Design an enzyme around this catalytic site. Structure first.
Site, mmCIF file in Angstrom:
data_model
loop_
_atom_site.group_PDB
_atom_site.id
_atom_site.type_symbol
_atom_site.label_atom_id
_atom_site.label_comp_id
_atom_site.label_asym_id
_atom_site.label_seq_id
_atom_site.Cartn_x
_atom_site.Cartn_y
_atom_site.Cartn_z
ATOM 1 N N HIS D 83 68.166 17.855 29.089
ATOM 2 C CA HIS D 83 68.889 16.809 29.805
ATOM 3 C C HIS D 83 70.354 17.206 29.911
ATOM 4 C CE1 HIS D 83 69.522 15.432 25.595
ATOM 5 N NE2 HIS D 83 70.644 14.904 26.050
ATOM 6 N N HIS D 85 73.439 16.272 29.221
ATOM 7 C CA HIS D 85 74.566 15.826 28.416
ATOM 8 C C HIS D 85 75.375 17.021 27.927
ATOM 9 C CE1 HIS D 85 73.065 11.522 27.247
ATOM 10 N NE2 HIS D 85 73.702 11.549 28.402
ATOM 11 N N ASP D 87 76.382 18.275 25.176
ATOM 12 C CA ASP D 87 75.976 19.134 24.069
ATOM 13 C C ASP D 87 74.702 19.924 24.337
ATOM 14 O OD1 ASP D 87 74.681 16.576 23.970
ATOM 15 O OD2 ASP D 87 74.350 16.763 21.813
ATOM 16 N N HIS D 88 74.137 19.840 25.545
ATOM 17 C CA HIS D 88 72.984 20.663 25.908
ATOM 18 C C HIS D 88 73.214 21.443 27.190
ATOM 19 C CE1 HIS D 88 71.091 18.694 22.658
ATOM 20 N NE2 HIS D 88 71.371 17.527 23.205
ATOM 21 N N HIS D 159 65.926 8.950 27.384
ATOM 22 C CA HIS D 159 67.195 9.351 26.801
ATOM 23 C C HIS D 159 68.237 9.605 27.890
ATOM 24 C CE1 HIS D 159 69.911 10.919 23.816
ATOM 25 N NE2 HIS D 159 70.176 11.874 24.686
ATOM 26 N N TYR D 190 72.305 2.644 22.642
ATOM 27 C CA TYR D 190 71.964 2.133 23.964
ATOM 28 C C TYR D 190 71.633 0.647 23.905
ATOM 29 C CZ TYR D 190 71.088 7.006 25.579
ATOM 30 O OH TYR D 190 71.180 8.330 25.942
ATOM 31 N N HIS D 224 67.870 19.091 19.506
ATOM 32 C CA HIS D 224 68.348 19.079 18.133
ATOM 33 C C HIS D 224 67.212 19.517 17.232
ATOM 34 C CE1 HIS D 224 72.201 17.248 18.984
ATOM 35 N NE2 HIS D 224 71.565 16.530 19.886
HETATM 36 C C1 LIG Z 1 70.660 11.570 18.644
HETATM 37 C C2 LIG Z 1 71.675 12.018 19.374
HETATM 38 C C3 LIG Z 1 73.070 11.540 19.055
HETATM 39 O O1 LIG Z 1 73.998 12.595 19.317
HETATM 40 C C4 LIG Z 1 73.934 13.094 20.656
HETATM 41 C C5 LIG Z 1 74.665 12.183 21.662
HETATM 42 N N1 LIG Z 1 75.701 11.362 21.041
HETATM 43 C C6 LIG Z 1 76.760 11.819 20.365
HETATM 44 O O2 LIG Z 1 76.997 13.013 20.204
HETATM 45 C C7 LIG Z 1 77.709 10.782 19.799
HETATM 46 C C8 LIG Z 1 77.052 9.505 19.335
HETATM 47 O O3 LIG Z 1 76.059 9.050 19.946
HETATM 48 O O4 LIG Z 1 77.558 8.929 18.346
HETATM 49 C C9 LIG Z 1 78.781 10.452 20.778
HETATM 50 C C10 LIG Z 1 80.098 10.822 20.511
HETATM 51 C C11 LIG Z 1 81.107 10.517 21.421
HETATM 52 C C12 LIG Z 1 80.802 9.845 22.600
HETATM 53 O O5 LIG Z 1 81.789 9.546 23.492
HETATM 54 C C13 LIG Z 1 79.488 9.475 22.872
HETATM 55 C C14 LIG Z 1 78.479 9.778 21.958
HETATM 56 O O6 LIG Z 1 75.236 13.049 22.649
HETATM 57 C C15 LIG Z 1 75.986 12.498 23.736
HETATM 58 C C16 LIG Z 1 73.708 11.239 22.353
HETATM 59 O O7 LIG Z 1 73.046 11.639 23.322
HETATM 60 O O8 LIG Z 1 73.612 10.067 21.923
HETATM 61 N N2 LIG Z 1 72.556 13.340 21.089
HETATM 62 C C17 LIG Z 1 71.501 12.930 20.506
HETATM 63 C C18 LIG Z 1 70.207 13.392 21.049
HETATM 64 O O9 LIG Z 1 69.112 12.959 20.615
HETATM 65 O O10 LIG Z 1 70.213 14.230 21.983
#
Ligand SMILES: C=C1CO[C@H]([C@@](NC(=O)[C@H](C(=O)O)c2ccc(O)cc2)(OC)C(=O)O)N=C1C(=O)O
Ligand SMILES: C=C1CO[C@H]([C@@](NC(=O)[C@H](C(=O)O)c2ccc(O)cc2)(OC)C(=O)O)N=C1C(=O)O
Ligand SMILES: C=C1CO[C@H]([C@@](NC(=O)[C@H](C(=O)O)c2ccc(O)cc2)(OC)C(=O)O)N=C1C(=O)O
Ligand SMILES: C=C1CO[C@H]([C@@](NC(=O)[C@H](C(=O)O)c2ccc(O)cc2)(OC)C(=O)O)N=C1C(=O)O
Lengths: 266, 266, 266, 266
Positions: D83, D85, D87-88, D159, D190, D224
């Protein structure tokens, strides 16, 4: 009551759609388009470069000619453009899909390509073709290199805002051959004076004539071969009557000045 | 030697291009397209909404009919789409340029619109039109509101991946009228089985028949009026024979099942 | 083992983020940004124009100040830009979503805006912001008109390839006031000579100094008020020390020439 | 007076940014990302495929590990995503620029990628990264093939709307190994119920749990590694505790149901 008119296809002279076999221009540079539309393949040790592709329906022919040259579809690395009208950039979207090649172009060409030639400054929606994205935006004078061969961009706005000449040095008989692929300098049916969509059109053309005159050039080619007096259909004699850059610019400027006076005269 | 073929225009039946004057559907909803292509204008206290625009050459006619309804170009706030083929989304780019309206659409419709209908899953490049961008991406069930009127999206993939029904509640004679503008459920010339470009096509159509059956609906309209048995040319009798959502879905599913069996039979 | 570094936010001086109430510049033109970032609201009988928006987090403040001026979100018709860096174009995507305004910009600004300032010629990915699309591409000298007020684009490339000055004529005390909103002429940390990503950088800056000198101007404003000696925090005295276009261009060229010599000197 | 807040960087746990050497998963499949972010390299006779890239700052590390595997930058043919986001999909734009690879993704992922993750359904603009374009749009169940290796897309929305599982068959010890790279099934922070930006969120998650249960799978991996009980830091024991698809889906659904009840409970 008259219904609204049907959509009209962009139709061209048959010679623009007449396939030809690859015609060697220099040691690594080949004309692989049609009798009357240029499409240059430059073959390097690390893949091939395509400069223009012609009309949308030429995609398959271009790939056929690439295969004749030993270039598989995935060996095409880079597509460069003179300008993003349907008869030069027509097959770019399909070529990208079938080859994985990247497109490098200036911002003006990129935005016109991304709307498939629609909302043209002069032609409206009459010459739309499948849109494509540019993967690399280039600036004036920027060098793009594939397999050690350096291609230099020279912006020459007028025919389109993004019109570009590309130069590179090939070889023949152990001697360097400076090739200049210069864009169109025509203004077919354009309103030249006081054009609200292109207020500095005349100033840009005048500057572009000078740019073309100054290009590094032993051998000039153009998107329409006839504009530089090439005749692709006669084989090894195809380049015999080719113009210099100075003669090409002079002929285009004389035509432009005459058209400007006729526009003043109605 | 045969030259490559000329480009072929997307031509349609003359009735699809036959202008008509605005035809009132409910208190704020008007058919303003042609005799055989739907284009719905919904007029609110805070601007107008257009649902589909027909063919590319209908842009001027739509603006003419908007003016007859008291809607200046800048009063158009929002364009919604059934699906992004040339005969329903054709004039969207021009309308955006001339009105400032935003387009709201799902991601599938947005990507097809942004490539002007090129590289269609079934039709290739044969139905390309001027590309346009979506300004708001919407999800299934999402509500878009203009001037207090809420439009709800119901995804019904199949005819295109992004095919959408739109519902809203208007009035007539002081009573609510639940309007459902449901997309096409046809599959004209499509390969239904084992289609590599649309592997779950049959599953999506089957789900979409069920979605259409369940729509909130007192009055069904469709992009092609004939698909729901409307006849725009007969004025106040235009809606007399209109199908229910259940009948529209049933007729489309019977046609689909028969086509599926014929595809199995060659 | 060191992990890779964390992402670094684009942080700015606090005064760039210090809200201010609307400050009248002329009869229809107001500074509505922060103490140290310009955002000009021009109010017409047929809607408002915004020239620049500042940083991404200024979106809400801009809408607040628009409301103080009698401009509802949907009354914003047009967004124009000096250049598409994060501290001037930052909130454009959000403003488009919340107002329905269109963006007009040249092709260079459009491509930089569409990638959210990423892959900057000089700053890499350090100043990325939410991407936005341009709805109208404009050419040098092109006139954009809202509510009868004509805004003219003057390209002044250098600080970015798409850097633009905007001019329009407002009024004050019954007399015309020719306003020139000229872009930055700084080159902060740029490699000026032999820059492979911008080979004609020096030539473009030199031309842009001349363009700024020749602008029609009774009152000069700049994206950073200090660059033209404005002080937004002192109210009716804010414009007292403002530079002419000639003085602004002269100061920028002296700074550029000195920086060029220092680059030659290491 | 408080100034507006500074922009905040997307910061992550240090282990997400901790480089690791390539870890072999099967005969042609390698983990080449960080200790806590998956990035899979699949090496074929006709080039390599990358599935996810991690954070934006991982671009150089990925290319380093590709070189250790014998994969030059230009040998990377295709980028696939779980997806879009930060971090991917973080480094996708840079990877495209430096390798020439194409991106294949569904329409939902393509539109999110093209806006660099801005205007996220749940996270607003807090996780923006450099935008990138998708070169090929794929449908549910569509097969993408590189060097004879077929990758099949399985849509699993929730997600993100575009969340996708990818499956392919590798080998180990002369036996086939069906690999399933399944996306996240988390919903971190969410709003699940009555979310105006995602009205069918709960229905999509419930369907996606079932989709994950039914995937062809001898070896499950996740963006992850901890979500499927991998531990990349322990080498040949990294896969020892890995979950089945059924266990991964069950754990995610239990977590989702509990979160749903807590949302009902405040
Ligand atoms: C379980 C998580 C939580 O961490 C990352 C996530 N979230 C975060 O890294 C983190 C959070 O959820 O606390 C976050 C930090 C800063 C932000 O502005 C938004 C989200 O990436 C965007 C997300 O998708 O929710 N991703 C996963 C995932 O399953 O991919
Ligand atoms: C000299 C010409 C004329 O022919 C083509 C051109 N024009 C046409 O092919 C032709 C015309 O100019 O008569 C045309 C046909 C149909 C149209 O809708 C628009 C233009 O391509 C779009 C153009 O750029 O003007 N191109 C050149 C050129 O120099 O590149
Ligand atoms: C039932 C039809 C058939 O006519 C149009 C359609 N097709 C055509 O107009 C027509 C055709 O299907 O024969 C067509 C003409 C030319 C082409 O290149 C492609 C299609 O529009 C693209 C289509 O979606 O199939 N649309 C519908 C519809 O239900 O929306
Ligand atoms: C004179 C400056 C310097 O400050 C900003 C600028 N630079 C910065 O804000 C600042 C810097 O130049 O030191 C910066 C901080 C962080 C970065 O990653 C990049 C640049 O905005 C991007 C720039 O355009 O150079 N803008 C101007 C300007 O004239 O517009």
């Amino acid at each position: 009551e008259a219904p609204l008119p049907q959509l009209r296809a962009y139709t061209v002279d048959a010679s623009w759609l007449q396939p030809m076999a690859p015609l060697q221009v220099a040691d690594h540079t080949w004309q692989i388009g049609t009798e009357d539309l240029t499409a240059l393949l430059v073959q390097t040790a690390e893949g091939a470069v395509l400069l223009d592709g012609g009309m949308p329906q030429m995609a398959g022919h271009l790939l056929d000619n690439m295969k004749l040259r030993g270039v598989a579809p995935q060996d095409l690395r880079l597509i460069l453009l003179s300008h993003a009208h349907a008869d030069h950039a027509g097959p770019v979207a399909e070529l990208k899909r079938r080859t994985g090649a990247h497109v490098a172009a200036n911002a003006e060409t990129a935005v016109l390509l991304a709307r498939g030639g629609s909302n043209d400054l002069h032609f409206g929606d009459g010459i739309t073709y499948p849109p494509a994205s540019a993967d690399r935006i280039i600036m004036d004078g920027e060098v793009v290199t594939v397999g050690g061969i350096a291609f230099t961009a020279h912006f020459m706005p007028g025919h389109t805002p993004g019109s570009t000449a590309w130069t590179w040095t090939d070889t023949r008989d152990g001697k360097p051959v400076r090739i200049a692929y210069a864009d169109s300098l025509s203004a077919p049916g354009y309103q030249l004076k006081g054009n609200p969509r292109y207020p500095r059109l005349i100033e840009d053309y005048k500057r572009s004539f000078a740019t073309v005159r100054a290009l590094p050039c032993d051998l000039l080619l153009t998107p329409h071969p006839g504009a530089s007096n090439w005749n692709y259909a006669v084989g090894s004699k195809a380049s015999a009557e080719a113009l210099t850059c100075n003669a090409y610019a002079d002929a285009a400027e004389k035509k432009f000045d005459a058209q400007l006076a006729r526009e003043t005269a109605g």
